Design goal:
This is part of a larger assembly, with three copies of chain A, one copy of chain C and one copy of chain E.
Chain A: E1 8-11, E2 22-24, E3 30-34, E4 41-45
Antiparallel strand pairs in A: 1-4, 2-3, 3-4
Chain C: E1 3-7, E2 10-12, E3 18-25, E4 34-39, E5 45-51, E6 58-60, E7 68-73, E8 78-83, E9 92-98, E10 115-116, E11 120-124, E12 133-137, E13 148-158, E14 163-167, E15 177-178, E16 182-183, E17 189-198, E18 208-213, E19 218-223
Parallel strand pairs in C: 2-11
Antiparallel strand pairs in C: 1-3, 3-8, 4-5, 4-9, 5-6, 7-8, 9-10, 9-11, 12-13, 13-17, 14-18, 15-17, 16-17, 18-19
Chain E: E1 4-6, E2 11-13, E3 19-25, E4 33-38, E5 45-48, E6 62-65, E7 71-75, E8 85-90, E9 104-106, E10 114-118, H1 122-127, E11 129-137, E12 145-150, E13 153-154, E14 159-163, E15 175-182, H2 183-186, E16 191-197, E17 205-210
Parallel strand pairs in E: 2-9
Antiparallel strand pairs in E: 1-3, 3-7, 4-5, 4-8, 6-7, 10-11, 11-15, 12-13, 12-16, 14-15, 16-17
The chains are: A mainly beta, C mainly beta, E mainly beta.
The structure holds a molecule of 2 linked components (NAG-NAG) (4 copies).
A molecule of 2 linked components (NAG-NAG) sits at the interface of chains D and E.
Protein name (chain D): Spike protein S1
Organism (chain D): Severe acute respiratory syndrome coronavirus 2
PDB class: viral protein
Chain lengths: ~50, ~40, ~230, ~35, ~210
């Protein structure tokens, strides 16, 4: 939906209210998103680690 | 002839306030605190 | 904007029927009562009929009940009168009017009879269509007084109400005064138009009344001269 | 169309305590296990 | 139903002064009253719709006051576009009933009429009928009386009058009375007279002719 980024997308267990599209963590980065065509929630995890 | 019943309503007014809000383990807000409302808060 | 137009009037011999129609534009027609309102000539306003939405609640006047019938069509946005067995007291200008506002819904405008039609003339007369008979009313000393004297033209016995008399093809506008036509017991109209002109000018200039009857095709010019 | 049916019986204005009432979501963001200000 | 009564009923005024019209009712209507104005020849239009509230596009010199009964419309500082006939209508219960109107006339210094009597034209006496016209020219008070007399007998029930609209220049009226007889009955009498009574005349004026005298 215009929000760009990089990472790994995985199936999620969070459950958004109908007026919500993005989810943010404590550092205010987007870590969850609702897919605009299948209406399923996805988690976004960074790629570099270790 | 118009009768009215016995319901009630309540009116309060808003102020610019700073709130501390925790949500839940799954969205939905459980609690929030009003600063400027006691030296404790 | 918002508008109401009518049609259907004219002339009807008594004992016969007519049908007035009224078409609206710019409302939500199912949210308003509609009304028919007459006005007799030389008189005041008087309601004839009221109807609610879906035609359940219908008010007639006591003078007209059992002879007239209202109808609505909310799909076609239309209002009717079926006028049966007409009488000589139904000669009037009729108006479509909206004043309803229907206190169960959220309508717009004002509460009152804010929008109106333009009027439709109904004439009831066993007459037909007759032409006018014209005489010149000569200027005379019994009409003369000092500096001025009056002369005119009497145009009488005609049914088709709109008739006109001018002076000198429309030249004289000073003192020219056409009086309201009068309706006789015979059923035909009559009137007389008179103009004053300096008494030094009794016969001197041209004073020819031009009589034109538009429903018929009568056109006659009559000269008025002092009495022999 | 208008009818004012009021009765001239003023009324002492009562009050009551809204202890912790009237908290809305001041955004459309989703959040879990946090303490946002 | 609910009947309405308007009290002034042919009020007369100058230009630029106060004018009051009162309208009463036969039940209790709360504020559902409208004031309507009709100029001669047109459709009526609303001016006040809930007994005190003007419509959009109405000048601020009209005023409405109201109660359960006894409603009032007031025009202060009259202007020449405000001379018409004013109705009061109730909006409370169906069917909605009108008042009676109030024509409003323009003042004018008492002016007596010029009077003139016209005998029937020779052409008409051929046809077999005699119209005898009597004209009253220019005059403020329209409350004029036209008495026809035939050989000094006051004539009742064979005349018709009509009157003009108040003149836009000199604010006067003019009146034409027509007496209609048969040729036969016309030829039975001699003096035809027309006696006009009016406030500008100290005593009535009679114009008369003698049938058959050139
Ligand atoms: C968006 O369009 C896609 C197709 O372009 C829709 O996907 C269909 O979803 C239904 C589920 O009810 C499947 O049975 C179809 O096979 C899907 N089509 C394809 C081509 O995969 C999708 O439903 C549309 N969005 C919405 C909200 O209806
Ligand atoms: C969000 O939390 C609520 C309670 O805080 C969860 O509701 C309970 O879920 C457990 C197992 O998931 C059930 O055994 C309970 O019966 C539920 N209680 C009620 C009152 O419903 C809920 O499942 C959580 N997750 C969501 C909404 O996705
Ligand atoms: C409702 O009550 C009010 C006040 O009693 C009436 O409104 C008028 O209000 C103006 C000022 O807003 C006063 O100057 C008037 O004197 C009031 N009118 C009267 C007659 O006292 C109003 O008329 C009432 N409404 C109805 C429908 O009766
Ligand atoms: C809606 O508001 C407009 C003004 O914004 C009104 O338009 C005025 O109408 C009067 C009456 O003809 C004119 O004298 C003004 O010059 C108009 N002003 C403008 C800016 O057009 C309009 O009458 C209002 N509509 C209603 C139904 O009240």
């Amino acid at each position: 939906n215009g929000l760009t980024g990089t990472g790994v997308l995985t199936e999620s267990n969070k459950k958004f209210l109908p007026f919500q599209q993005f989810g943010r963590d404590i550092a205010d980065t987007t870590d969850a998103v609702r897919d605009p065509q299948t209406l399923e929630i996805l988690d976004i995890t960074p790629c570099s680690f270790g | 002839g118009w009768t009215a019943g016995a319901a009630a309503y309540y009116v309060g007014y808003l102020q610019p306030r700073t709130f501390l809000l925790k949500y839940n383990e799954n969205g939905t807000i459980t609690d929030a605190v009003d600063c400027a409302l006691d030296p404790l808060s | 904007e918002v508008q109401l137009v009518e049609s259907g009037g004219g002339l009807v011999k008594p004992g016969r029927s007519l049908r007035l129609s009224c078409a609206a534009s710019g409302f939500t027609f199912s949210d308003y009562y509609m009304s028919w309102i007459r006005q007799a000539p030389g008189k005041g306003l008087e309601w004839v009929s009221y109807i609610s939405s879906s035609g359940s609640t219908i008010y007639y006047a006591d003078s007209v009940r059992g002879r007239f019938t209202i109808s609505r069509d909310n799909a076609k946005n239309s209002l009717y009168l079926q006028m049966n067995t007409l009488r000589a007291e139904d000669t009037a200008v009729y108006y479509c009017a909206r004043g309803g506002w229907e206190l169960r819904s959220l309508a717009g405008g004002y509460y009152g009879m804010d929008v109106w039609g333009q009027g439709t003339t109904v004439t009831v007369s066993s007459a037909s269509t007759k032409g006018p008979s014209v005489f010149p009313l000569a200027p005379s000393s019994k009409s003369t007084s000092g500096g001025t004297a009056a002369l005119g033209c009497l145009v009488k016995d005609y049914f088709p109400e709109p008739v006109t008399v001018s002076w000198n093809s429309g030249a004289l506008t000073s003192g020219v005064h056409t009086f309201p036509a009068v309706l006789q017991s015979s059923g035909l109209y009559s009137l007389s138009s008179v103009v004053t002109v300096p008494s030094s000018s009794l016969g001197t200039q041209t004073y020819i009344c031009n009589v034109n009857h538009k429903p018929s095709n009568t056109k006659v010019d009559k000269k008025v001269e002092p009495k022999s | 169309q208008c009818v004012n049916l009021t009765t001239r019986t003023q009324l002492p204005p009562a009050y009551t305590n809204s202890f912790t009432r009237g908290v809305y979501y001041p955004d459309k963001v989703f959040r879990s296990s946090v303490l946002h200000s | 139903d609910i009947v309405m009564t308007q009290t002034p009923f042919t009020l007369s005024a100058s230009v630029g002064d106060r004018v009051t019209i009162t309208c009463r009712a036969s039940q209790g209507i709360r504020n559902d009253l409208g004031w309507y104005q009709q100029k001669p020849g047109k459709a009526p239009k609303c001016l006040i719709y809930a007994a005190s509230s003007l419509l959009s596009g109405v000048p601020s010199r009209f005023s409405g006051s109201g109660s359960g009964t006894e409603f009032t419309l007031t025009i202060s500082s009259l202007q020449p576009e405000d001379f018409a006939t004013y109705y009061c209508l109730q909006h409370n219960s169906y069917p909605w009933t009108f008042g009676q109107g109030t024509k409003l006339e323009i003042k004018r210094t008492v002016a007596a009429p010029s009077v003139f009597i016209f005998p029937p034209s020779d052409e008409q006496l051929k046809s077999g009928t005699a119209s005898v016209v009597c004209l009253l020219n220019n005059f403020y008070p329209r409350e004029a009386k036209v008495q026809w007399k035939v050989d000094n007998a006051l004539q009742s029930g064979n005349s018709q009058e009509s009157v003009t609209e108040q003149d836009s220049k000199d604010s006067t009226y003019s009146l034409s009375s027509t007496l209609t007889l048969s040729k036969a009955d016309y030829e039975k009498h001699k003096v035809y007279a027309c006696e006009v009574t009016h406030q500008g005349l100290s005593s009535p004026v009679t114009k008369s002719f003698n049938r058959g005298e050139c």
